[PDB]
Each structure stands twice: as C-alpha cells, then as structure tokens.
Design a binder for this molecule. Structure first.
Ligand SMILES: *[C@@H]1O[C@H](CO)[C@@H](O[C@@H]2O[C@H](CO)[C@@H](O[C@@H]3O[C@H](CO[C@@H]4O[C@H](CO[C@H]5O[C@H](CO)[C@@H](O)[C@H](O)[C@@H]5O)[C@@H](O)[C@H](O)[C@@H]4O)[C@@H](O)[C@H](O[C@H]4O[C@H](CO)[C@@H](O)[C@H](O)[C@@H]4O[C@H]4O[C@H](CO)[C@@H](O)[C@H](O)[C@@H]4O)[C@@H]3O)[C@H](O)[C@H]2NC(C)=O)[C@H](O)[C@H]1NC(C)=O
Ligand SMILES: *[C@@H]1O[C@H](CO)[C@@H](O[C@@H]2O[C@H](CO)[C@@H](O[C@@H]3O[C@H](CO)[C@@H](O[C@@H]4O[C@H](CO)[C@@H](O)[C@H](O)[C@H]4NC(C)=O)[C@H](O)[C@@H]3O)[C@H](O)[C@H]2NC(C)=O)[C@H](O)[C@H]1NC(C)=O
Ligand SMILES: *[C@@H]1O[C@H](CO)[C@@H](O[C@@H]2O[C@H](CO)[C@@H](O)[C@H](O)[C@H]2NC(C)=O)[C@H](O)[C@H]1NC(C)=O
Ligand SMILES: *[C@@H]1O[C@H](CO)[C@@H](O)[C@H](O)[C@H]1NC(C)=O
Lengths: 51, 126, 110, 51
C-alpha cells in the first residue's frame, strides 16, 4: 500500500494534449511499503529446503 | 503518569500577541500527536491542528490562516503556540491534549482520541 | 463544513435511560467510523467517554453504549445518577486531516 | 515542501511551458519522484535539472 495524495493536476499543452501530474499531498506523508506474514513465510521457505 | 503542565493565564491588548506552552511529563512525547482546542464560556470547542514532535510538521485548522503558529522543543518536551493579532473574539479558554500514537506507516492523525489533557489556561483581550 | 447538530439539553428521572443524537453530513460519519464522545464537568478538563461509537475506552464503567446508522450516531446511558450531570460533546473525523467537534448538549438531573 | 512539513523523496520543480497558443510560455509546477530526475549540468548547478 501507500498513503494519500491530493489529486492529479490537469495541465493542457498546445492542441489539447492533456496530461496529468502528481500535485500536492494532504495530509501527512508516509511509506510506500509491503507486508508479508512471517509464520507462513518461515515454513514455506523451509519446505523449500526439504524438497 | 501522563501529565500536561500548562502556563498561567494572561490578558493582552487588542492586536497584541500571547505565547502559550504545554510541557509533557511521564511519557515519551516523541511518539504521540498533540492537538489544541479553544472554548469560550458558553460556546463549543474549536479544534486546532496537531504538531508532530519529530519532524516538526504542523497542521492548522480553518479560520486561522496563519494567525496562530505552533513550534516545539524536544530537549525539554515542550510545545509552544504563538497567538498573534489578538482581537476581542479571542477571549476563551485554551487546552492542550495528547493525541494518538504515531506509527510511521500510515496516517493516524485523524483519530480523535484525547485521553490526557492539561489544566488549561485563560486568555483574555481588553 | 459546519459543526454537528446537537440538542441543547436533556433531562431524565433517576434510573432512566437517555439517548443523545448527533447529526452531520455523510462526508463525516457516513464515510468513516472515527467517532468519539466526550463529557466535561464545569470547571474541569473534559474526559473521553467513547471509542468507535460502539467501542468502550479503558477506565469506563459498563453503563455507556451506542451505535451509528447512516449519517447519525448516538450514545445511550443506563442507570442515570447524579454523577452523570455533565456536558457532552460529539466529535468526528472530517477527512483532509480535519476534525469536527459538535455544539454540545447539557445534561440535567431530576 | 508540503502544507504539513516536507518530503525527501520528491522534488517540487518549477516549469517553463507553452500555452495553448504557440505564442506564449507560462509558469507551472509539478512534483516528481527523486529517481526520475537527473541534474543535467557541466558543474554542480543544483538549480538545473532534466527529466
Ligand atoms: C503492515 O505492517 C506494519 C508493521 O507492523 C503494521 O503496523 C502495525 O499496525 C498495527 C495496526 O494495523 C499497529 O497497532 C497499532 O499499534 C499501536 C501501538 O500500541 C502499542 O504497541 C505496544 C508495544 O509498545 C509499547 O511498549 C513501549 C515500551 O516502553 C511503551 O513505551 C509503549 O507506550 C507501549 O506500551 C504494544 O504492546 C501495545 O499492545 C500497542 O499495540 C496501538 O496503540 C494501536 O491501537 C490503539 O489504537 C487503535 C486504533 O486507534 C485502538 O483501536 C486500540 O484500542 C488502541 O487504543 C488503545 O491504544 C491507545 C493508544 O493511544 C490507548 O491510548 C488506549 O487507551 C487503548 O489502550 C494499534 O493497535 C502497530 O503499531 C503497527 N506496527 C508498527 C507501527 O510498528 C501494519 O498494520 C501492517 N499493515 C498495513 C496495511 O500497513
Ligand atoms: C485523500 O485526499 C482526498 C482528496 O482531497 C480527500 O478527498 C476530499 O474529501 C473531502 C471531504 O471534505 C471533500 O470535501 C468537500 O468539500 C466541499 C466543500 O466544503 C463540500 O461541498 C461540495 O462538494 C461538491 C463536490 O462533491 C462540490 O461540487 C461543491 O462545490 C462543494 N460545495 C458546495 C457549496 O456544494 C463537500 O460536501 C465536501 O465537504 C474534498 O473536496 C475531497 N477532495 C476533493 C478534491 O474533492 C480524501 O478525503 C483524502 N482521504 C482521506 C483519508 O481523507
Ligand atoms: C511548488 O513550487 C511552486 C513554485 O513556488 C509553488 O507554487 C506557488 O505556491 C505559492 C504558495 O503556495 C503561491 O503563492 C504561488 O502563487 C504558487 N505559484 C503558482 C505559479 O501558482 C507551490 O506551492 C509548490 N508546491 C509544493 C507542494 O511544494
Ligand atoms: C519561463 O517561462 C516564462 C513565462 O513568462 C518566461 O517568461 C521565462 O523566460 C521562461 N524562463 C524563465 C527565465 O523564467
């Protein structure tokens, strides 16, 4: 997962070439991380060893 | 135990400013948010934003737009508010209250859990 | 973006169960579950009374309950005594790192 | 910088683009992640970057 961001600024260049860009961020700022269950990982990685 | 020691009451002229502080004790203040509220004698409770103790980032509520600033000092675990451009409408009672636990992995500031509050202080404008 | 609507005051005979309601816009309480109740005795700092309307905080006796539905929520107090003579406030998360506190309501005893 | 503090992994970059009419340039800004911007310079010019 990741945290909140405000919105996607809509900027038009020349003949209608709309593009989006990351604007401001509200409220606080955090990560940017992934979570994995340990006990499942442990025995799965061990079973890899036995085979 | 978790205590919040505030400063004494004060009265100032219109247009002046007053400094309000709140001191943490009994816990590691660097892991919890801190919010403020004002209450006039007969009105509701106006909420002002939190101040992060570590990075020092500050949020402010609407209807201030900079007339109030918030700072901190981690060496003595004390927060300070500077209330500028006082008017007669600012006559009120001020309190500090401790917020939720800061987790570094998700936004938790929006959890209005205030279990420990200071004794408060009176601010009057002449 | 105004405060939450609250009654002015409530009353009740000793023992009587009392229900207090708070009404806002779905953007506040219909969206999330971040709702809390506070009570404050005149001349004292407030005390927290409710977590997640239906969750009890620590240090609270088994006299307070509540629930939410749609755009409103309420608190129920059983076994009314003189000790419950206090002011009550609602407050909830608004989104955008803001919090709404309600107008409040005064409890009277008979 | 952000309304509540600062962020280290992004930069706020002032732009120099064309309007919808090919006669004028206008000021703009967007935020970008640090690893997608390179300081194209012959020296340590921290105010000149390129996508
Ligand atoms: C991804 O992976 C990350 C990495 O783990 C996960 O983060 C974990 O996420 C959970 C929730 O999803 C977080 O739990 C929160 O934890 C808070 C931490 O509180 C305690 O931690 C204690 C360990 O330390 C203690 O020991 C210290 C030593 O001195 C001491 O100083 C310190 O004060 C403390 O005693 C642990 O023992 C304790 O049991 C706590 O868990 C909790 O506080 C959070 O819970 C509170 O808030 C809930 C919602 O607001 C509420 O429902 C709870 O009832 C609880 O409120 C109670 O707590 C209040 C705290 O102020 C208290 O005032 C009140 O009276 C009640 O008692 C919540 O449980 C966990 O910390 C976090 N891990 C971290 C940050 O490392 C992610 O979840 C994973 N998933 C995703 C999607 O990211
Ligand atoms: C992550 O960030 C997002 C993006 O900001 C957060 O979304 C934001 O949610 C809030 C809730 O307050 C919206 O607030 C609205 O404010 C307007 C003005 O007060 C209120 O009224 C009306 O809204 C409509 C649009 O729905 C608009 O057409 C009307 O002009 C406006 N006013 C009138 C007179 O009708 C509205 O009811 C809400 O109160 C933010 O606007 C919304 N963001 C955006 C860009 O709309 C999201 O909350 C945040 N995530 C978290 C966890 O908070
Ligand atoms: C990114 O930088 C731009 C450039 O200064 C900032 O844009 C200005 O922001 C200030 C205050 O918000 C305004 O007074 C100016 O009018 C803005 N400029 C323009 C052209 O609108 C912007 O705030 C910065 N944003 C972030 C998130 O850092
Ligand atoms: C950036 O765009 C503006 C638009 O006024 C232009 O005037 C300017 O010269 C371009 N570069 C500079 C120097 O700002």
């Amino acid at each position: 997962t990741r945290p909140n961001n405000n919105t996607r600024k809509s900027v038009r260049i020349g003949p209608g070439q709309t593009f989006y860009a990351t604007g401001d961020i509200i409220g606080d700022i955090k990560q940017a991380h992934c979570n994995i269950s340990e006990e499942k990982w442990n025995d799965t990685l061990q079973k890899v060893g036995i085979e | 135990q978790v205590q919040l020691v505030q400063s004494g009451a004060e009265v100032k002229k219109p247009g002046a400013s007053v400094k309000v502080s709140c001191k943490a004790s009994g816990y590691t203040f660097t892991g919890y948010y801190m919010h403020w509220v004002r209450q006039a004698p007969g009105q509701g409770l106006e909420w002002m934003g939190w101040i992060n103790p570590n990075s020092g980032g500050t949020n402010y509520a609407q209807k201030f737009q900079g007339r109030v600033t918030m700072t901190r000092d981690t060496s003595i675990s004390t927060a300070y508010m500077e209330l500028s451009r006082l008017r007669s409408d600012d006559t009120a009672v001020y309190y500090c209250a401790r917020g939720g636990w800061i987790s570094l992995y998700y936004d938790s500031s929006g959890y209005p859990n205030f279990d420990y509050w200071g004794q408060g202080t009176l601010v009057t404008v002449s | 973006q105004s405060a939450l609507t609250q009654p002015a005051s409530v009353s009740g005979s000793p023992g009587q169960s009392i229900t207090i309601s708070c009404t806002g816009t779905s953007s506040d309480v219909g969206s999330y579950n971040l709702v809390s109740w506070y009570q404050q005795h005149p001349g004292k700092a407030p005390k927290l009374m409710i977590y997640e309307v239906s969750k009890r905080p620590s240090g609270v006796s088994n006299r307070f309950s509540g629930s939410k539905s749609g755009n409103t929520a309420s608190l129920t107090i059983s076994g009314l005594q003189a000790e419950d003579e206090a002011d009550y406030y609602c407050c909830s998360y608004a989104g955008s790192s803001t919090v709404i506190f309600g107008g409040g309501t005064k409890l009277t005893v008979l | 910088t952000v309304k509540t503090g600062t962020v280290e992994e992004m930069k706020n970059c002032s732009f120099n683009t064309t309007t919808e009419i090919r006669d004028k340039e206008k000021k703009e800004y967007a935020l970008f992640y640090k690893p997608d911007i390179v300081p194209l310079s012959e020296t340590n010019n921290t105010s000149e970057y390129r996508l």
